[PDB]
């Protein structure tokens, strides 16, 4: 079975073109066909094309049909995504997938159309607004609810373009009762989102916190901790 | 084009019940049907081909039924890690121009559960910055309707907040909701009094968080 690996999070201005790569390892890459699947935010999914590796033939959604292009090279093992002429409806995240056909280097080929194989996406946002990192702001655990009892705290990423940015708490050591939330597009047209987690309170002077932001598509990679 | 329903788009039932959800097409496609389980921040994950087959690893309350037009999956005990967006897929025609259906929902009905509230001052590093962010937080709580009152003074204040929710958490089924406030550091300053008044039907009564500027 093939593991499959996408590209980074992208920022393309309208009536430009995107390639997304995705990288398989593992099982024979010839025996598989690959499929891209797209998904606009809260929407659901939009199966794009398809590629018969092994003849190296793709066939694509008709209303993508003219500005879409899905190739893969064998000696790479590496599947490709062309996307030309982006509008915002571009706008999504956009999955690598594949499924084994068979010994289709032997003749064979069983044509599934299913997808059992998933890369993790790579999102690509379609504007024209500059990219811009965050500033992380901490979250203090002044705040208690029970008698003692559970605290919270967090780190707030605030100001950022485009999406996403990822959050985790002492460098994944913290996973346990994090709560991140889904980032939110501000006033000035700018997101933001808020990382929190409930600790022991108890554990405020003695356990340290910080949690491990990253904003990729600007660079910014930050460690904020978090002081009650 | 060969349209792919899926209704309802959104559907509520209790842990350890059984959900049926519901996909057709608008022609037949025999048994070229699948089924995908997608959760939060995750890629889909294929459980059913063939309409009726399981695939690797997963687990037999998952179970395909249906062929032609008609299909339906079933999780015979739900459990809280279920929670996600289930979607079908054919691909009987060719060329391969495959679809899918709009996806259905799945929320665990579970229990009500009163949030529990905790209400966060702006860093002084933000202050810095000439703005204020004054987060409050409502944690663990079912269902998902919540209401957040923010009073700088007892002054209620509006169209001056934003709130993001997490989606139904995969081990306890319970919502987080985050509102935050935002102000000029300059109105900041002028005040003293900020609290969160939360209303949930896990409440008795509203409760309310706050901090004095300082």
């Known amino acids: 079975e093939v593991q499959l690996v996408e590209s980074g999070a992208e920022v393309k201005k309208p009536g430009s073109s995107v390639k997304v790569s995705c990288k398989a390892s593992?099982?024979?890459?010839?025996?598989?066909?690959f499929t891209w699947v797209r998904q606009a935010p809260g929407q659901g999914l939009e199966w794009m094309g398809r590629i018969i590796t092994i003849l190296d033939v793709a066939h694509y959604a008709p209303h993508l049909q003219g500005r879409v292009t899905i190739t893969a090279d064998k000696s790479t093992s590496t599947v490709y995504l062309e996307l030309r002429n982006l509008r915002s409806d571009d706008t999504a995240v956009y999955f690598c997938?594949?499924?084994?056909?068979?010994?289709?280097?032997?003749?064979?080929?069983?044509?599934?159309?299913?997808?059992?194989?998933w890369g993790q996406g790579t999102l690509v946002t379609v504007s024209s607004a500059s990219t811009k990192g965050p500033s992380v702001f901490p979250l203090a655990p002044s705040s208690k609810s029970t008698s003692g009892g559970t605290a919270a705290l967090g780190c707030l990423v605030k100001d950022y373009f485009p999406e996403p940015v990822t959050v985790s708490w002492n460098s994944g050591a913290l996973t346990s009762g994090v709560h991140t939330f889904p980032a939110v597009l501000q006033s000035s047209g700018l997101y933001s989102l808020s990382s929190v987690v409930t600790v022991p309170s108890s554990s405020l002077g003695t356990q340290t916190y910080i949690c491990n932001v990253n904003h990729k598509p600007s660079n910014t990679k930050v460690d904020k901790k978090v002081e009650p | 084009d060969i349209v792919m329903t899926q209704s309802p788009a959104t559907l509520s039932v209790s842990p350890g019940e059984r959900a049926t959800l519901s996909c057709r097409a608008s022609?037949?496609?025999?048994?070229?049907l699948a089924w995908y389980q997608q959760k939060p921040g995750q890629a889909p994950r294929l459980l059913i081909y063939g309409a009726s087959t399981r695939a690797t690893g997963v687990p037999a309350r998952f179970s395909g039924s249906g062929s032609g037009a008609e299909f339906t999956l079933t999780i015979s005990s739900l459990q809280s890690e279920d929670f996600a967006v289930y979607y079908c897929?054919?691909?009987?025609?060719?060329?391969?121009?495959?679809?899918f259906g709009q996806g259905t929902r799945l929320e665990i009905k579970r229990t009500v559960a009163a949030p529990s509230v905790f209400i966060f001052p702006p860093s002084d590093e933000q202050l810095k910055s000439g703005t204020a962010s004054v987060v409050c937080l409502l944690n663990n709580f079912y269902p998902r309707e919540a209401k957040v009152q923010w009073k700088v003074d007892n002054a209620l204040q509006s169209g001056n907040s934003q709130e993001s929710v997490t989606e139904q958490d995969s081990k306890d089924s319970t919502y987080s909701l985050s509102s935050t406030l935002t102000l000029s550091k300059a109105d900041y300053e002028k005040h003293k009094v900020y609290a969160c008044e939360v209303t949930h039907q896990g409440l008795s009564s509203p409760v309310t968080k706050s901090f004095n500027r300082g």
């Open positions: 022609e037949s496609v025999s048994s070229d």
């Open positions: 997938a594949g499924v084994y056909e068979g010994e289709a280097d032997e003749g064979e080929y069983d044509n599934n159309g299913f997808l059992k194989h």
């Open positions: 593992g099982d024979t890459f010839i025996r598989y066909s």
């Open positions: 897929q054919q691909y009987n025609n060719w060329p391969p121009r495959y679809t």
